[PDB]
Amino acid sequence: QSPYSAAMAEQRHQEWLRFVDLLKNAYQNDLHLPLLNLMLTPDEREALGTRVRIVEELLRGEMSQRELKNELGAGIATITRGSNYLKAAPVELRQWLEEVLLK
Amino acid sequence: QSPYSAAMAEQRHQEWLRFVDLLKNAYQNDLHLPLLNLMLTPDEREALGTRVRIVEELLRGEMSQRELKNELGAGIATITRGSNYLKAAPVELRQWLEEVLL
Ligand SMILES: O=C(O)Cc1c[nH]c2ccccc12
Numbered sequence: 001q002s003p004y005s006a007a008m009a010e011q012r013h014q015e016w017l018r019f020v021d022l023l024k025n026a027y028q029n030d031l032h033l034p035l036l037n038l039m040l041t042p043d044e045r046e047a048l049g050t051r052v053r054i055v056e057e058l059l060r061g062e063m064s065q066r067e068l069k070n071e072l073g074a075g076i077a078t079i080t081r082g083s084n085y086l087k088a089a090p091v092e093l094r095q096w097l098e099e100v101l102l103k
Numbered sequence: 104q105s106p107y108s109a110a111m112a113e114q115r116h117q118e119w120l121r122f123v124d125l126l127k128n129a130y131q132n133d134l135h136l137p138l139l140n141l142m143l144t145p146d147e148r149e150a151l152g153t154r155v156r157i158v159e160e161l162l163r164g165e166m167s168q169r170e171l172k173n174e175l176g177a178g179i180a181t182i183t184r185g186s187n188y189l190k191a192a193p194v195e196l197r198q199w200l201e202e203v204l205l
């Protein structure tokens with residue numbers, strides 16, 4: 001069926017929340033590392049590691065475009081998307097990220 | 104430089120573990136949902152939700168290949184890779200997944 005429907009949106013939402021609770025329980029049982037190895041490909045794990053550094057440097061604000069590109073391998077489009085995500089983040093998350101990533 | 108180097112392997116280890124620790128801390132602070140919305144695109148979150156069901160139905164062993172494909176939209180190659188990962192999973196993870204998913 002069509003993925004663009006309320007019913008499919010609700011199904012995706014429930015499946016996503018199930019994964020979030022599964023990983024929560026994995027953390028609670030010290031199984032987070034093998035679970036994330038199973039559920040994410042190596043390139044996806046590498047990308048997540050890089051996106052942490054992109055968010056950190058965007059929040060810091062000291063590197064420019066070409067600096068971020070040459071240091072992290074992230075082109076301008078990727079950086080702009082990350083900046084859009086950061087702009088859309090709730091204030092509590094952004095302030096916590098400033099705290100934990102920059103201090 | 105080269106992605107296929109020992110130094111780059113070490114950098115990958117470090118950056119991945121920093122993400123794992125950040126997300127641990129986000130769960131501890133009830134910020135995991137917005138952090139995951141920030142670090143994963145919608146299609147990646149959708150894929151993760153589907154991968155949970157793939158792993159569940161592989162462990163259950165009741166659905167076949169065409170059934171898994173028609174129910175989850177996941178082709179044979181994706182199911183085969185998931186089965187490979189499950190075969191390579193450590194015993195403790197697999198027994199836990201059977202405990203919690205079934
Ligand atoms: O849009 C992308 O290329 C993926 C992506 C998801 N969250 C991000 C945060 C910072 C930089 C890139 C991404």
Ligand SMILES: O=C(O)Cc1c[nH]c2ccccc12
Pocket residue numbers: 038039040041154157158181182184185186188
């Ligand atoms: O290889 C893939 O297609 C992605 C993938 C990563 N972990 C998985 C678990 C089950 C099914 C597919 C995947």
